């Protein structure tokens, strides 16, 4: 049977090892970009490479093995480190200087843990339908009786660190029975390991890749044909008797089926035509579910003036605005020699910094930073580099989060395959959804329906 | 039977009136504040009266009689005036100078139309249980495919001006299925009426307190011993034979049946403890269900330097940053020479701007008023009025909004009965919550559920 298979990110890559393992080797990946890796992606910047997209594997030391983390740990031996996050209250930083108490700042931190936990009890208790859910938000008012959620400068950055910095997306959009708890670290663990190799975490794509495509003897590039870069599909044909997809040079492809891999993003932008259109049941499950973005801006400065040291690493902006540069890191570890800062915005944020120029972005930058450190002397970043995946057509966000609003069976119709075209990717993954791991897993998964049907002639969906 | 209402505002006002034709006049009407009206609530700002809360009479010339208006426009005879959004093309600015292309910005504007219209539609179309229900935003992504809603600064504002100004969340948490189309609309007419009288759209309170409650003769003042101001309930205690409740000064009085009337943002707050607490699903109902906040800041310059005249009463303000002080009213009709201008901010604005000073709250608005207005001299406003709703806790914010997740069922139990504990306003309102009309009609249908279980027996 012959499968093209969109997309070489994770999980076309791992969709299409799975399938090579269950002998159907008549295989053709076409990819838009000119590498593999997708989401998983890095990029020069000031002398180092540094990560445009994913950054952790997330989900480390619990009960059940994060299938990502010995590749990376083990067999790749990329360089990590794991994140501790115990020190935050010390680096909560004022609107307009200096930090706040920690105590103080503890104290919230921990009142914010505890209405997530009493979330958790509520969300077991929900009708698996979906059909009970609620927002996160929703949830915070009921348990610390408010008619709002945080509302003062510390308390929304508390929940913009522990909810936006994960999900993208505010708690008022975010479905609670979807998130709270999260199986990413219920099954996996607790821990997130930061990767810092100059190799980049996609390395683990090139490594699954190179164990069904074959590699250059001296150079280990991928020289199979199989393999096609630079291809970017636009049209899928499918009828009951195959499928025939095109490329935007023209290039015209047939198979059996067709495995898409592409981002939720990318099916909410109409790039990939389908002929006949996808049905509304699977059109309207497209567009209800959401395509969040998180943005990684990456600042160079002349000097140091932050703190390094114990608990450091990440530290808080309390501004009056919510979602306002608000989430900081410093690599004294991962990038020693470097002199550089990473804040992330994510949603609403992101989209007005992808409009502007990377100038003013510096420059509304380098005015928090004077607010926060007014007893130094700030040099301005030499370098900004400002990621925009929303305005990637190939992209067009960063990763999935389940809104209020989508229940589990629009859930299953926004993963359930129309004919011969199936579906994988971060966004189809039942448990996953938003991580490496997820578009991992959803790739062997999409994988298995498909031989089922062509090997076990077992066609039927759920 | 004796009941005890709590709060005089328009729901509990018009929940006390029904009783009374019922005959159910052993009343006792609590409330907080040293007056009546609630959200309906007028202050003088640079000599004038402006309203803090509720301006307009929302829903007029449609299929159906919005009840509040001929209480307006015939009985009192409020002095009014429709107002018209047909201009707004040509008065949208900016960031940084000048408005945009009129044809232009009438475009876009059209496009989000459309795409409402095909909400419409597809609303029309969901199950009743609420199961197909999704955010306005979502029906916006749907309809035009696209990974996202309006973004660009113009769009952002229209969209604002769309939905914000008429809800205070945006769309993105807003149910589609219960808000478009809007009921008020649809059944009482596309047209908005804005009050500007000196006796205040709160009048409309004072005279439906009238019909029933004493009154001077002189004075005309409610003089009334069933209407007790400056108090401020903290605790309904209620069993199966009565209730009790006590006020904040030590009062306690007793009755068979309570009638609360507090907004959803005080039953989400405390204020008021039940012995014993709510049921789960009560509660539930409750904190699930949104308590939005619209900001009007009112401004006093001294001379005008901005446009009057044709189409020029609205305006809008398309900053890069979404709700930034984007929705702008002048009031040559209403306030002629008094050169004040409204700008309406909400939600995250206006729970930021609560809590910073006036002072602060003003210089941020000169900027974006310079920045509009490159060519002119303009002068700093000489007053500025923020209203503090979400912080007064007798309020905790303007007016509720039905948010994606919540269905009919789970609505409906908001207005539920707990025992002899009966519950009206306008986040009870059937199908107008959020509005007057909708307070109104919320205290005599909670009325009238009281009357049939407390006098027929049939509840
Ligand atoms: C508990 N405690 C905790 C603490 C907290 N922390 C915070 C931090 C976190 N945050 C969140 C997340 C982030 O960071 N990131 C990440 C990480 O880190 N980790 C993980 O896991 N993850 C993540 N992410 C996500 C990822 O990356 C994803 O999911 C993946 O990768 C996906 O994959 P898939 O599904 O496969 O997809 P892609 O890649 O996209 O692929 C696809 C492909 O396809 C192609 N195309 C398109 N279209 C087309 C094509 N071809 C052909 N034709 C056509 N048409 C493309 O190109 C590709 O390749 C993330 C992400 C991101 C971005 C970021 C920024 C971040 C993150
Ligand atoms: C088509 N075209 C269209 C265009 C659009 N434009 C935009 C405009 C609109 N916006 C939105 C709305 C607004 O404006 N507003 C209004 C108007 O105007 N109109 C209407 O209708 N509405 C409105 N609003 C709402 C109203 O106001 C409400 O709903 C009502 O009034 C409510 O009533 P009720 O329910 O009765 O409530 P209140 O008043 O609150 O009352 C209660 C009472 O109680 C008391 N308390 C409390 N707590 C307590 C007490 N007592 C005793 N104890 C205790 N503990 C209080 O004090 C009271 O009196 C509105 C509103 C507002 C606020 C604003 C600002 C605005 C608005
Ligand atoms: C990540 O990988 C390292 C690499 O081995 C692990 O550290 C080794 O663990 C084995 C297990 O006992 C030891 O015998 C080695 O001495 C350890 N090596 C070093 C350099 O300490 C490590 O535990 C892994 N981390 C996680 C979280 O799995
Ligand atoms: C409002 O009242 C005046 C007073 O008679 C009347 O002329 C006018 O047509 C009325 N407008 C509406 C919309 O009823």
């Not at 198979?255 to 939720?264: K, Q, W």
């Not at 003036?305 to 114990?310: A, C, I, L, M, V």
Request: charge should be negative; include cysteine; proline fraction near 5%.
């Amino acid at each position: 049977p012959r499968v093209i298979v969109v997309g070489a990110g994770m999980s076309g890559i791992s969709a299409a090892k799975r399938l090579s393992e269950a002998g159907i080797t008549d295989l053709l990946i076409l990819e838009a970009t000119d590498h593999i890796g997708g989401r998983m992606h890095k990029t020069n910047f000031a002398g180092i490479n540094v990560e445009l997209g994913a950054n952790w594997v997330e989900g480390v030391n619990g009960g059940k093995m994060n299938p990502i983390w010995p590749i990376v740990n083990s067999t790749l031996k990329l360089r990590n480190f794991r994140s501790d996050f115990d020190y935050l209250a010390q680096n909560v930083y004022k609107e307009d200087g200096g930090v706040y108490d920690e105590d103080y700042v503890q104290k919230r931190i921990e009142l914010a843990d505890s209405v997530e936990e009493m979330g958790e009890k509520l969300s077991a208790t929900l009708h698996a339908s979906g059909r009970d859910d609620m927002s996160i938000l929703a949830m915070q008012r009921l348990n610390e009786h408010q008619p709002n959620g945080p509302a003062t400068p510390v308390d929304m950055v508390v929940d913009y660190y522990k909810f936006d910095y994960e999900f993208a997306e505010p708690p008022r959009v975010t479905s609670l029975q979807n998130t709270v708890p999260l199986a990413t670290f219920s099954d996996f663990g607790d821990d997130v390991y930061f990767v810092a190799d100059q190799r980049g975490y996609e390395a683990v794509v090139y490594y699954l890749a190179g164990q069904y495509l074959k590699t250059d003897d001296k150079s280990g590039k991928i020289v199979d044909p199989r393999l096609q870069l630079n291809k970017v599909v636009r049209e899928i044909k499918y009828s009951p008797g195959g499928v025939t997809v095109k490329t935007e040079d023209n290039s015209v492809y047939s198979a059996d089926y067709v495995m898409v891999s592409a981002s939720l993003g990318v099916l909410q932008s109409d790039l990939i035509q389908f002929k006949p259109k996808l049905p509304t049941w699977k059109v309207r499950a497209i567009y209800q579910f959401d395509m969040a973005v998180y943005t990684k801006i990456f600042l160079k400065f002349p000097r140091k003036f932050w703190p390094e040291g114990k608990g450091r690493e990440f530290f808080l902006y309390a501004s009056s605005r919510r979602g306002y540069y608000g989430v900081w890191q410093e690599f004294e570890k991962q990038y020693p020699d470097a002199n550089v800062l990473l804040v992330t915005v994510t949603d609403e944020e992101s989209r007005r910094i992808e409009q502007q120029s990377d100038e003013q972005t510096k420059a509304e930058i380098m005015q928090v930073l004077r607010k926060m450190f007014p007893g130094k002397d700030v040099p301005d970043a030499t370098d900004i580099l400002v990621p925009r995946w929303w305005s990637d057509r190939f992209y067009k966000g960063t990763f999935s989060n389940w809104p209020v609003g989508v229940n589990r069976y629009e859930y299953d119709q926004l993963r359930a395959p129309v004919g011969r075209v199936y579906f994988t990717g971060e966004h189809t993954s039942e448990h996953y959804n938003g991580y490496v791991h997820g578009a991992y897993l959803s790739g062997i998964d999409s994988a298995e329906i498909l031989i089922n049907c062509a090997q076990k002639k077992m066609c039927k969906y759920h």
